[PDB]
Design a protein around this ligand. Sequence first.
Ligand SMILES: [Ca+2]
Ligand SMILES: [Ca+2]
Ligand SMILES: [Ca+2]
Ligand SMILES: [Ca+2]
Length: 339
Amino acid sequence: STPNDPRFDDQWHYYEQAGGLNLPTAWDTATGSGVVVAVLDTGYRPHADLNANILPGYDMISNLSVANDGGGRDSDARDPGDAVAANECGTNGAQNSSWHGTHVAGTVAAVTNNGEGVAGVAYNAKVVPVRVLGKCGGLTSDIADGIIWASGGSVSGIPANSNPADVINMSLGGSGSCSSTTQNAINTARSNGTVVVIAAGNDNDNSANYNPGNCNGVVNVASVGRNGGRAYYSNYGSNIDVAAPGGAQSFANDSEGVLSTYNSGSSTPSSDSYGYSQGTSMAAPHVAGVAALIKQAKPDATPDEIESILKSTTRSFPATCTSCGTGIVDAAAAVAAAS
Ligand SMILES: [Ca+2]
Ligand SMILES: [Ca+2]
Ligand SMILES: [Ca+2]
Ligand SMILES: [Ca+2]
């Protein structure tokens, strides 16, 4: 099926033969109904083309300066904006707000067939926003608590999650080895039945050396462009499980990117928008959305079974993708394999 959203045709990454996810055929069978995806990111804005698919979440950011919302941990996972001034994070230049989590969440589950905006990969799933990134990024320990809570595990001082996730998406990372705090959290999420999907990073380097994609028991995702070959920035290596479209842009908001829900604010939030972004951060929620399609078709699927289905049903690369996992995720084939 093809949705009626007016920007669907701009979302090449869902349907073109070279670099797309092969979604229309998948949507004949699965859309994510009944499945919950936790998006561990900067938070969200209640975009008109997203909010109906948002569930209550949690804000794990403990450092008040990073949190930028007046306090420590709290129940409102909305994104206040992560804009920074020059040298606020050390030696950085000034940066506008990313609205990264709004973009990622829309790839997972933008409201679809509403005649407005964009479509989402798992458009009948629901997203639990777990805010773990703010100004200058996020703390490993807050991210790890996010993983635990998102899965339905217990974190001291935090109310129980009433919407435990089937799938975690982490479009985030840094350099270096996977820490024990992170691996512990991942092990907890997997033991609770939650599959963990992670962006491999954007350093054009060996993915062995970038976390949390280098943790064990995760689905680590490389990025292809619209050509179906490796996006120039994508990490690559033996620990990549699969690839998905993350886009390959040559200027800001280039339509060669991945189009999703977004916000027009430079610092503070403003009007809803749609924007094209790129990264392994954009590839990961494609894969998280397919994991949700799989879980609708196979409700008792384990994390290892979901990873196996994703990896075993990929399609060929039409252009060079060295050490990009088994292939490009093929939503239709994955749903068939889970049915
Ligand atoms: Ca707070
Ligand atoms: Ca908050
Ligand atoms: Ca829409
Ligand atoms: Ca893996």
